[PDB]
Design a protein around this ligand. Structure first.
Ligand SMILES: Nc1nc2c(ncn2[C@@H]2O[C@H](COP(=O)(O)OP(=O)(O)O)[C@@H](O)[C@H]2O)c(=O)[nH]1
Lengths: 342, 8, 330, 50
């Protein structure tokens, strides 16, 4: 007899297959969603810190390149804004430093060389550019630009090693899907991220039919951002639309919803000057109050849910805060286990 | 997945 | 500058003298098509998105959101290979004509080639084909070292596996590219996208030869007619449609009242006379290519049919569903 | 700021062209000459077990 070569093999494949559908049902897919620059990536990063393999010296170096990258992007946007808000430079020499930095190959940055340090430091000193930074609420610019740019010092030195904080802030250009697996001792979690998808959602959204959980994210600091090029669109009114559409999907019925209200530390910092009312006429409460504003924002967002039966479990978060998340997430953990154990 | 991250 | 666009509309109109309907009319229609399930491929644990036949018309690959890609013995039933994919978010598979490699991609934007029959432990990840900024729509080899790919980021790309490099990029689409199909000779491919219009491309030269409008919505499926001078398109607008390259225009629309669900897949029959399509309403449909009649149906799935596959010897059909099942029809 | 599509229109209008009648007939004839070779269109005997 000469047969059953891969017939006998097919037996042992169903063996592995059943063991792997067995393990994978215990995986809890937690889909991160929310607009641009609203905290998802950072969250994932925090998970690797509290519940995962950390960022050891080696792991860190792999970011050095990205640190540089951000800076240029940060500066690059800043430069555009100048010619959009019609703000000129205080110092003449800097206009050359702009052309210099304009032509910078968005992505090709190996090291952070001397001619580029000055170019950028020079500009960071220009009272036009700082004024542009002071009006970042119009156009879109990363929220930790100041962080790095007030540190050009260390970032540009030869023997430079980044640290957790830098790590927690670099824009890490996402090819497409970001999935991260980890576990609370007995249970395994699998975070999901699709922010860096340069395509239409309506062709792949259904790939997420009844996942364990949805974690939706709003930036609180977002309330007063408008984007003049993008025709004065309120950046948080924008996020309200994503969420409304996200919250009406049939795909997500069985999926528990969590609303992270992120960039809170940035909220009450700024709620003292910018006023919530003259951006959302309906706002009724006091001024110069974080708590009143959080509660309000959390309401317009929850209001977008059509039907009693589906409870949203929100939290207030600072995604840069390692101990905040460490403590916020335990709550989520429970309200997921307690809620999906039946 | 990246780029490490995930793992990586 | 743009009424030059309103010039091919005179060209294709002067080319129109008779319809494909008018001509295929006094020819007798199709005999009778009622295929029954010849096999049920059972092994995936979540919904399957793509499948592709091997050139031997017997072995085939699947691609399921279960993070497992599977090689099947279609005649028998036996699983030959199971691929533990790094990303369970896959959206297509490929079968090398040689059957030495197998490609697959998805929301990762990495076209993963897999070295099949080997002397390695089991089956290894061979190549990383990275360069796309959106989900991997579909893919099919030209040989063991070149593959055309189409993706969400509105572009299709021809690669060189050996070196893993972007050989030539085929840009021209507005909406996402959903589909692709090589011509018989692999001299030039057709690709359907969410711009509601497919494109005929020249493989080596790069540039887009002909653009084809028609559908009032997203194409998800495209298909080269056996001889290589026509193609089928499967769209959300619920119509299948026919285009001749040499005529440079639509010849047939496989509409139908009372059906309104989208179409995920299209694949012709050896002769070209049958258009097998796969639908949202869990039903596959068998169309008279020439007459525009609805011959039969492959009703047999519980969820929508995500992909089709017709054999090279045209004696069998695979259908792939979101119900984690494949069925062979005869 | 935009110009580059106007090009494609010239590359697309200037190509080969064929009257539908011939286009339909040719590919109707291909079809006709492969019918008996199409197992799904004219069933091969039942002892074609696959
Ligand atoms: N102060 C503060 N900074 C934040 C917070 N959340 C995110 N950031 C920072 O602002 C930037 C936002 O990027 P990211 O978290 O990746 O947003 P996403 O990728 O669009 O979801 C990152 O550099 C973060 O380090 C927050 O709650 N508070």
């Amino acid at each position: 007899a000469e047969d059953k070569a891969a017939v006998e093999r097919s037996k042992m494949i169903d063996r592995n297959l059943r063991e792997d559908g067995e393990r994978s049902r215990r995986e809890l897919k937690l889909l991160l969603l929310g607009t641009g620059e609203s905290g998802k990536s950072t969250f994932i990063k925090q998970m690797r810190i509290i519940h995962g393999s950390g960022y050891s010296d080696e792991d860190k170096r792999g970011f050095t390149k990205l640190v540089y990258q951000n800076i240029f992007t940060a500066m690059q946007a800043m430069i555009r804004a100048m010619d959009t808000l019609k703000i000129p430079y205080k110092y003449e020499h800097n206009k050359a430093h702009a052309q210099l930095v304009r032509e910078v190959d968005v992505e090709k940055v190996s090291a952070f060389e001397n001619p580029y340090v000055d170019a950028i430091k020079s500009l960071w000193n220009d009272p036009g550019i700082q004024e542009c930074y002071d009006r970042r609420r119009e156009y879109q610019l990363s929220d930790s630009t100041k962080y790095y740019l007030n540190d050009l010092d260390r970032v540009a030195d030869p023997s430079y090693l980044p640290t957790q904080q830098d790590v927690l802030r670099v824009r890490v250009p996402t090819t497409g899907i970001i999935e991260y697996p980890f576990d609370l001792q007995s249970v395994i979690f699998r975070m999901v991220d699709v922010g860096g998808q340069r395509s239409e959602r309506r062709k792949w959204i259904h790939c997420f039919e009844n996942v364990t959980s949805i974690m939706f994210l709003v930036a609180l600091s977002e309330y007063d951002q408008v984007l003049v090029e993008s025709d004065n669109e309120n950046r948080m009114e924008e996020s309200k639309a994503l969420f409304r559409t996200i919250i009406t999907y049939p795909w997500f019925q069985n999926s528990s919803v969590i609303l992270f209200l992120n960039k809170k530390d940035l909220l009450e910092e700024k709620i003292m000057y910018s006023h919530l009312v003259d951006y959302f006429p309906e706002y009724d409460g006091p001024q110069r109050d974080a708590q009143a504003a959080r509660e309000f924002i959390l309401k317009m967002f929850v209001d977008l849910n059509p039907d009693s039966d589906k409870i949203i479990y929100s939290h207030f978060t600072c995604a840069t805060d390692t101990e905040n998340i460490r403590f916020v997430f335990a709550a989520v953990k429970d309200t997921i286990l307690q809620l999906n154990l039946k | 997945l990246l780029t490490t991250x995930x793992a990586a | 500058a743009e009424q030059l666009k309103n010039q091919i509309r005179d060209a294709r109109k002067a080319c129109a003298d008779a319809t494909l309907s008018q001509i295929t009319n006094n020819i007798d229609p199709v005999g009778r098509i009622q295929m029954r399930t010849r096999r049920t491929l059972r092994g995936h644990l979540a919904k399957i998105y793509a499948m592709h036949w091997g050139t031997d018309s017997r072995l085939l690959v699947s691609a399921s959101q279960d993070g497992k890609l599977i090689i099947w013995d279609s005649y028998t039933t036996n699983k030959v290979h199971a691929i533990p994919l790094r990303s369970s978010w896959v959206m297509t598979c490929a079968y090398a004509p040689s059957g030495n490699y197998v490609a697959c991609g998805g929301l990762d934007n990495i076209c993963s080639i897999y070295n099949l029959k080997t002397r390695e432990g089991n089956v290894r990840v061979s190549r990383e084909l990275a360069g796309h900024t959106g989900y991997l729509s579909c893919c099919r080899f030209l040989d063991d070292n070149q593959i055309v790919t189409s993706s969400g980021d509105t572009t299709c790309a021809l690669w060189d596996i050996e070196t893993g490099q972007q050989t030539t990029t085929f840009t021209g689409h507005t909406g996402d590219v959903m589909s692709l199909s090589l011509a018989p000779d692999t001299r030039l491919f057709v690709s359907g996208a969410c711009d509601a219009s497919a494109k005929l491309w020249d493989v080596r030269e790069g540039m887009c030869r002909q653009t084809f409008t028609g559908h009032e919505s997203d194409i998800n499926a495209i298909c080269f007619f056996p001889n290589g001078n026509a193609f089928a398109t499967g769209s959300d607008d619920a119509t299948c449609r026919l285009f001749d390259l040499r005529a440079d225009q639509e010849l047939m629309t496989y509409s139908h009242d009372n059906i309104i669900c989208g179409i995920t897949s299209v694949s012709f029959s050896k002769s070209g006379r049958l258009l097998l399509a796969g639908y949202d309403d869990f039903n596959c449909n068998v169309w008279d290519a020439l007459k525009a009649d609805r011959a039969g149906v492959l009703a047999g799935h519980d969820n929508r049919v995500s992909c089709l596959g017709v054999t090279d010897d045209g004696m069998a059909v695979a259908t792939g569903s979101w119900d984690s099942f494949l069925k062979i029809w005869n | 700021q935009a110009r580059k599509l106007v090009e494609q229109l010239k590359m697309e209008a200037n190509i080969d062209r064929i009257k539908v009648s011939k286009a339909a007939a040719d590919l109707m004839a291909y079809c006709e000459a492969h019918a008996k070779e199409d197992p799904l269109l004219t069933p091969v005997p039942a002892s074609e077990n696959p």
